[PDB]
């Protein structure tokens, strides 16, 4: 049943889209010392999962911030400076976010190829015998 | 027996529902860019039951909207439209073969 392939590729494409949006936010918030409520932005990362026990769909199970320390900068005249004159900025690393942009896009496009190829195989089964 | 219902089965009601689903899916694709528009889903099991003898379901977004309010995930809509077209083609083949077999028996050809 190739219709299962559609579920798996669709779940993979959804997972890559979540990863791409996470990368988009990290690049946009790699220079933000402030935040909406009260907590400095930390590089977010989606968590993929495989519930192996046919096909095993890939599901995103939540967003987890990176555990790297916040990059402290000496801005003593800044309003938000601490007692030592340090301000903290998000731990977003440019090199790894660019790799995620490349990896997520190439992984997204190859799952479309599988679904398109799997779509053809179902059609040829319909034409079998006639 | 010897009736069109008992002969065609559920392949006549299924075709109508599959065309209904394609109208719903195409609506979501067209209304993807309209802000405030909520993606519309269709229950096949309930629709088939209603068709055989005879409410609004919304699709939960995977990610928050960027402010417009539109919850249409165009990646999912294309995938569902592709699946709906394949299953609709099978239903036409299933329903079309019901008439061909009926004509074959009533004429012995």
């Amino acid at each position: 049943s190739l219709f299962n392939v559609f579920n798996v590729t669709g779940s993979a494409m959804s997972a890559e889209s979540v990863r791409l949006n996470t990368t988009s936010s990290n690049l946009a918030n790699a220079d933000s010392v402030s935040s909406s409520a009260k907590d400095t932005y930390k590089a977010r990362h989606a968590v993929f999962g495989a519930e192996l026990s046919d096909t095993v769909p890939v599901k995103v199970m939540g967003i987890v911030e990176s555990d790297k320390p916040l990059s402290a900068e000496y801005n003593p005249d800044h309003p938000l400076a601490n007692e030592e004159g340090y301000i903290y900025k998000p731990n977003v690393n440019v090199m790894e976010e660019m790799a995620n942009m490349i990896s997520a896009s190439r992984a997204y496009q190859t799952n479309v190829q599988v679904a398109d190829s799997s779509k053809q195989m179902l059609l040829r089964t319909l034409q079998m015998g006639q | 027996a010897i009736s069109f219902d008992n002969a065609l089965g559920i392949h006549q009601h299924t075709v109508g529902v599959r065309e209904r689903n394609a109208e719903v899916i195409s609506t979501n694709i067209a209304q993807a860019n309209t802000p405030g528009y909520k993606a519309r889903g269709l229950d096949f099991a309930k629709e088939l039951q209603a068709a055989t003898s005879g409410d609004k379901l919304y699709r939960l977004p995977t990610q928050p909207d960027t402010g417009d309010g539109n919850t249409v995930d165009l990646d999912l809509e294309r995938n569902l439209f592709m699946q709906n077209q394949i299953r609709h083609q099978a239903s036409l083949d299933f329903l079309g073969s019901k008439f061909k077999n009926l004509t074959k028996a009533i004429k012995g050809e």
Binding site: A37 | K38, P61, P64, D65, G67, G69
Partner: peptide, 17 residues
């Protein structure tokens, strides 16, 4: 679902709400 999905907020300041 039967309830339409809620609209996102994106507040400028969370305390203001």
């Amino acid at each position: 679902s039967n309830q339409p999905p809620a609209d996102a907020s994106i507040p400028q300041d969370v305390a203001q709400m």
